[PDB]
Amino acid sequence: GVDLGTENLYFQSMKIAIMGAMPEEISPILEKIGSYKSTSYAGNKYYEATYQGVELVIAYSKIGKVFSALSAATMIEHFGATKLLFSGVAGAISTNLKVGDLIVATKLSQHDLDITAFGHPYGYVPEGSVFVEADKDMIELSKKVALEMGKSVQEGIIATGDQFVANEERKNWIGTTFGADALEMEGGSVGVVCNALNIPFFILRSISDAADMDASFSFDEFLESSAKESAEFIMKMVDELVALP
């Protein structure tokens, strides 16, 4: 076998899944890529593109843990993704996050997963883990990108559950129990699936609201702008991942 050392500039095996939960979260991705095909599968549409020597598979999952698990599994198992990036919006728990701020997940839990009647901690089931770890290399890359962009990007724990949280008491329980800086409805599900399949993943969220009584209105106001903020950063990540030595 002969490899000349430049093959990756022409075509490599890497296939990057880029996912959101809602159409507003991925359309800015599809606008940057511009040209792509689409496949109807698993009740959804999966868009594919040839991008600078790698291939992209892009989709929105629909909301929640089950749909996001299905899309993540589909992108890996059926569309052959080898890395996964998630872009979307989230509710802020930490007071240092405000509308529009980006947060990269260090690790994620499922805040509504509860078999505590058997004395296990919140978020745990046998053979599982309270937290699932996002990929360290991509987190480092995100630091490089943030500086290049001149942007302030926090790193923290994101908690995932199948509820839109619009209630400070719930919000505070989640923050306290898990040390979570932000909450959302897909990240931890996606992480568990990627982890199961040995696929490194990266979860990015732009804050849309503060998970309180005003959460739904803020979410409506800032969905499009926050979604665009996340998506712009994610495309910079893709360009970086294509550039690896």
Ligand X SMILES: Nc1ncnc2[nH]cnc12
Active site residues per annotation: 25, 209
Print the binding letters for residues 87-116 with a second copy: x by CB under 8 A, - otherwise: -----------------------x-xxxxx
Separation between Cα atoms, residue 1 and residue 8, nearest integer Å: 16
Q: Does 130 bind a second copy (CB under 8 A)?
A: no
Nearby residues of 94 by Cβ (< 8 Å), 6 or more positions away:
154, 156, 175, 181, 182
DSSP 135: P
Token pair for 86 = 């998630």
**Contact partner at residue 90 from a second copy, ligand X, none, CB < 5 to 8 Å by partner kind:** ligand X
Q: Does 236 bind a second copy (CB under 8 A)?
A: no
Please give the residue whose beta carbon sits closest to ligand X in the complex. 91
Q: Which stretch binds a second copy (CB under 8 A): 141-149, 156-164, 172-180, 236-244?
A: 156-164
Contacts with ligand X by CB under 6 A: the residue count is: 14
Contact 134, 191 (CB under 8 A): yes
- The β-bridge partners of 184 are 160
**Contact partner at residue 173 from a second copy, ligand X, none, CB < 5 to 8 Å by partner kind:** none
Nearby residues of 98 by Cβ (< 8 Å), 6 or more positions away:
92, 207
SS3 of residue 244 by DSSP: coil
The response to whether 212 counts as a known ligand-binding position is no
**Least Cβ distance, residue 111 to ligand X (angstroms):** 10
The residues in 75-104 that bind ligand X, with binding defined as CB under 6 A, are 89-91
Distance of CA 168 to the CA centre of its chain: 24
Q: Which stretch binds ligand X (CB under 6 A): 31-39, 102-110, 188-196, 203-211?
A: 203-211
In terms of CB distance, is 74 or 142 closer to a second copy?
A: 74
CA angle 82, 145, 209 (to 5 degrees): 90
The response to whether 101 counts as a known ligand-binding position is no
Q: Does 200 bind a second copy (CB under 8 A)?
A: no
**Residue 54 backbone phi and psi in degrees, to 5:** -115, 175
Separation between Cα atoms, residue 171 and residue 178, nearest integer Å: 11
Tokens 């599900």 label which residue?
A: 189
Q: Does 112 bind ligand X (CB under 6 A)?
A: no
Q: Does 168 bind a second copy (CB under 8 A)?
A: no
Residues that bind a second copy (CB under 8 A): 42-44, 62-67, 69-70, 73-74, 77-78, 110, 112-118, 125-128, 162-164, 166, 188-189, 192-193, 195-197, 215-216
The annotated binding site for adenine is made up of 165, 209
